[PDB]
Design a protein around this ligand. Structure first.
Ligand code: COA
Ligand code: COA
Lengths: 392, 393
């Protein structure tokens, strides 16, 4: 009574800007929409229906208000999907929605379920970072705490210094992300993975205009240039990172439909990819967001591969210096790294990205008819997730 | 690849404190950290195993706000001074969380993702109360579209009661037995093994520390109880049958369960102690809301290929007396085998913790009585129920 988990479908909403094109939706409606999206997608070509899903696991970071009370379950019920399907919500910060695919893969593996949905939601426009704690952030740690665990903006500086990354270095990476995202969109790469989402049109204020617009484009793309990026002011006094070279605050959701390979084939669905190796490792608190070194390491070790074997990497662009520190250590081919742009241009709904990255990856492997992809992400509390997926 | 054979190797819990009770002095992260260290230490007595050997931790926690925000499982671990390379995630399927957590570690072992994991659960209700995780306007945490008749939990316990013709006497009786059975277990010593005494700040008559750091080892919810006493109590809702005497207690506690691939366990010289026969987290009927233990109990029995008769020991969480009774009315088990060591009505119910607690309590009872199969099942907010059938090895 065990199983062989495979990705059967994956899809994502477009990613909206803060107070942008999806900010009209209640966070539970966004996630619901996407949850319904994957099931519907899989229903085109098969018998599969929402009731056939057994468990849903959703990543979400700031689990407060609209994102309190186990948003994965509420989203599901709110989309009018079947009440018998279980659902759990998870937090390993920015790893959450990646970690969620690992967990569904595990339950399938253990024979607990045959059909699962991993997903991730973040509606930063509506629940901002910090919403989940009082204003006195000193209080969310015990008085004993003495770990030099810096904030994330300081972490990107500490990492940069460690590797000798410079303001020009990042501004260049920054620019390429915008360049490559703009290229993907021009060529139509994201068309398949994206599920247009209807959304309340809001006015110049943040009130609804009665209109219900269909959104299908990532809103963070922006004509960008080395000059423009050079003009931008650092986030921290003396730091190298700016809005131009950090991720964007965003609204979005993604979902990935998993099954035991045999059940999939039985419903007449095509097994599309499988996890070769997965990991959620702890990182070094001091540098905090440099974990992608460690997670990339583990899954390569577990997979019995070397970075050379990977065709496509998705390493989340929380901060330029995170991706560059990783590249400096693991020396990959940067033509294979964030080939369709990263979060610096596409934005970074925290709980969602992990499932978004897997989604993006799978599709690119399929577009280019390649095989192995690595996904890896730094995360608050000094943790990093890692996956190597493989096309089937 | 390379997959695995998940088995429980160790399990432990703090005593469960009352609201503003014996553990209310501890920051929620300290409580969880203490127990996280407890299991590993326990396993270290008889083997080489050390905290660094754990690969992933997954902790259940419901009101993930403030002290319980920012992925408590991780912070708790770091705060206990345990190794920083060990990954950790925190989960919410309400009261199911800490049970769902054992499922997920069991899956990751199964999938070959890790060889050593810790499932655990924390809730420090004294310090982060239900609701903390949302603004006062609780209308706002649902979209404006929402029209599901998903009642609050106190109303759910009434709706369920009516469905099954459960009466105030019915519940008051069950309520009383829970206190009787918890009080028996403690008298005989049943919980001694599973419990890990926790050092805690002594607080005054106010809620300020007295400088004293006392060692706590007993569940604080036990209370001389009687049918008269329970009859005296006022209902929580006007016209309801449930009272504080027959609902769960608001509590502080944590529990942790060390898993491994059976082979790795044996290699470290640790004894595989139990394994999951079947697991489930099912959706329930929104209208009745907390009657999901019918469904979850059903699924795992189905999956396990067993009937309720096969189960030696049941742990069905006593959120509300009517929840257990409704279940029993449907599944007709032997109530001598149901919550044999008392339930949350007497022992309290730290929401994010209970799930891991129940598995812990069950495993130990199977061991004490030298029996084999146990069922754990819980109702949970959002109309969900977890369910596990574990088996001694
Ligand atoms: C850094 C951060 C705060 C952004 O700050 P922000 O000022 O609110 O970002 P904005 O988009 O409002 O402003 C950034 C600027 O980039 C500028 N920009 C980018 N490319 C440009 C170009 N080619 N020419 C001119 N300007 C350009 C914009 O003009 C914009 O300023 P404006 O308001 O004058 O238009 C945000 O990206 C962030 O917090 N990221 C990470 C958060 C985090 O901790 N994440 C982890 C989650 S646990
Ligand atoms: C119902 C609930 C609110 C308890 O209410 P409470 O009044 O705060 O409980 P207290 O312990 O303060 O009071 C209950 C009474 O039981 C009484 N009691 C019990 N046995 C008794 C006996 N034999 N003789 C006399 N009194 C007895 C106590 O005297 C006590 O009242 P007191 O303050 O006069 O001593 C709480 O149990 C609860 O909220 N439970 C469920 C919460 C929930 O939703 N959980 C799900 C999490 S998602």
């Amino acid at each position: 009574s065990m199983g062989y988990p495979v990705i059967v479908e994956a899809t994502r909403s477009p990613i909206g800007k803060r107070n942008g094109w999806l900010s009209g939706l209640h966070a539970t409606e966004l996630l619901g929409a996407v949850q319904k999206a994957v099931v519907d997608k899989a229903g085109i070509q098969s018998g599969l229906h929402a009731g056939d899903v057994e468990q849903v696991i959703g990543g979400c970071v700031t689990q407060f208000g609209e994102q309190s009370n186990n948003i994965s379950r509420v989203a599901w019920l709110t989309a009018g999907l079947p009440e018998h399907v279980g659902a759990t919500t998870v937090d390993c910060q920015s790893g959450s929605g990646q970690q969620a695919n690992h967990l569904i893969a595990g339950l399938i593996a253990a024979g607990a379920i045959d059909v699962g949905i991993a997903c991730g939601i973040e509606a930063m426009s509506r629940v901002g970072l910090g919403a989940n704690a009082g204003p006195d952030r000193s209080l969310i740690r015990a008085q004993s705490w003495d770990i030099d665990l810096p904030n994330q903006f300081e972490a990107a500086e500490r990492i940069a210094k460690r590797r000798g990354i410079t303001r020009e270095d990042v501004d260049v990476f920054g620019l390429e992300s915008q360049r490559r995202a703009q290229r993907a969109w021009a060529e139509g790469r994201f068309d398949r993975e994206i599920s247009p989402i209807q959304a309340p049109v809001l006015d110049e204020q943040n009130q609804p205009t009665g209109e219900r617009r269909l959104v299908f484009r990532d809103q963070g793309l922006r004509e960008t240039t080395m000059a423009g990026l050079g003009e931008l002011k650092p986030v921290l006094e003396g730091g190298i990172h700016t809005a131009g070279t950090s991720s964007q605050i965003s609204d979005g959701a993604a979902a990935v439909l998993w099954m035991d390979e045999a059940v999939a084939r039985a419903h007449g669905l095509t097994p599309r990819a499988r996890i070769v190796a997965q990991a959620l490792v702890g990182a070094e608190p001091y540098y905090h967001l440099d974990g992608p070194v460690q997670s990339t390491a583990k899954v390569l070790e577990k997979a019995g591969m070397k970075i050379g074997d990977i065709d496509i990497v998705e390493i989340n662009e929380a901060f330029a210096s995170v991706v560059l520190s990783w590249a400096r250590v693991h020396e990959p081919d940067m033509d294979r790294v964030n080939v369709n742009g990263g979060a610096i241009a596409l934005g970074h709904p925290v709980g969602c990205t992990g499932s978004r990255l897997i989604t993006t990856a799978l599709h690119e492997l399929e577009r280019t008819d390649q095989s192995l992809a690595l996904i890896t992400m730094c995360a608050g509390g000094a943790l990093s997730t890692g996956t190597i997926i493989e096309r089937i």
